[PDB]
Symmetry: D2
Subunit: 103 residues, 4 copies
Amino acid sequence: PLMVKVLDAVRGSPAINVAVHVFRKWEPFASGKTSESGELHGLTTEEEFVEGIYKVEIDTKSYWKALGISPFHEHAEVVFTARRYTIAALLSPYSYSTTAVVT
Amino acid sequence: PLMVKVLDAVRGSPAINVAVHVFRKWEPFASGKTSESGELHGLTTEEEFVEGIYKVEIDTKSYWKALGISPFHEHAEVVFTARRYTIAALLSPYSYSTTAVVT
Amino acid sequence: PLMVKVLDAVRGSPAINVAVHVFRKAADDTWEPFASGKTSESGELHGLTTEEEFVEGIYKVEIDTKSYWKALGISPFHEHAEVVFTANDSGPRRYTIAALLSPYSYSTTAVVT
Amino acid sequence: PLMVKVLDAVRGSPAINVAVHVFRKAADDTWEPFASGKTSESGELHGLTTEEEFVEGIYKVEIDTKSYWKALGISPFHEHAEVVFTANDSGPRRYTIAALLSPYSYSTTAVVT
Ligand SMILES: Cc1[nH]nc(N)c1-c1ccccc1
Ligand SMILES: Cc1[nH]nc(N)c1-c1ccccc1
Ligand SMILES: [Ca+2]
Ligand SMILES: [Ca+2]
Ligand SMILES: [Ca+2]
Ligand SMILES: [Ca+2]
């Protein structure tokens, strides 16, 4: 029911091995690291993911430090009210954009 | 070797049935319409897609008119020098962002 | 030293009368309220803070995009847009945080001078 | 009536000395050169045109992002960033085209007042 996809706008690549944490209003409850394709599947389950207010926190700063690229943000976080949901993020050192795809 | 993916930032959805045209420096040579997932596969072939300068033109204005949403841009176009390439676009009525994923 | 600018990608306009809340991380690792304000008719919020107040630290700027969209009559996806960043670590700088809003997306960038 | 603002998402800065070319679609459906300039130290390009010159029509603003990135020593993906839009169709308006640049991406929005 919830997937994250992270892309790198500097290198033109998926953002790989990025830490992602999910919280519900903040109680952490799901987290993982992006795969080779920049995607993080299997965070949660249909049973667990109830309506409510969620935060997806992506650890952009350690991703940029692993690349030797100087970052601005501590993270990127995405807070929304809750179908399948994809939270997509496109990362640059001093900016990020995020959209939700709800199908 | 070349795929396009289009997302809608107003509705939170893939952008479906959007016309996409590809040109090589401008000679048109590949075009199609996005699927239900907002993706357009099979534009070209490994043999056809040589190094050079390309333009991907996405017909955003007819997509926004089909939705009853007033657009700004005539289109979105993406011009680059040429692996597999994904051109991703995220659409709003008065803005668009585009990135390339090169794997 | 800190300004915030907010634009609407649906209407092609400045995002007016948007609430912006700033917090600073405190020593016990909670967020301390630091400054707030609302965007003007140009979508800009100036006068949040002063050179004297704005010390080094980790800040959170939270833009209330939910109430902006509901005041337009639209049901948005996100509760707010934000940036969390470390400020002034090599001395004072001037930071502009710009945010571009749509119902299901936003982007934000920082300009540091 | 037309301004362009360009920001760098890598450096967190204005994109200075960026070339911007404006074209207008002519009656035979070719692009006619309309105006050009370079961004200032604030990343802004003012004085492109005048109310009198800027009539209704379909414009293309082409931002030379390739030479910006190569002058920084970086090999970018896109040749340029752009917008193509119909201007002044219900009378004069003021248009700001803003663009945010990274080596493999860009976004652009329009603010119309
Ligand atoms: C192109 C763009 N800008 N901002 C974004 N989140 C995206 C995007 C990210 C992943 C997939 C498709 C689009
Ligand atoms: C925050 C953002 N995302 N995409 C953009 N073009 C912007 C923007 C760029 C220049 C000036 C102001 C905002
Ligand atoms: Ca769990
Ligand atoms: Ca063909
Ligand atoms: Ca310090
Ligand atoms: Ca007219």
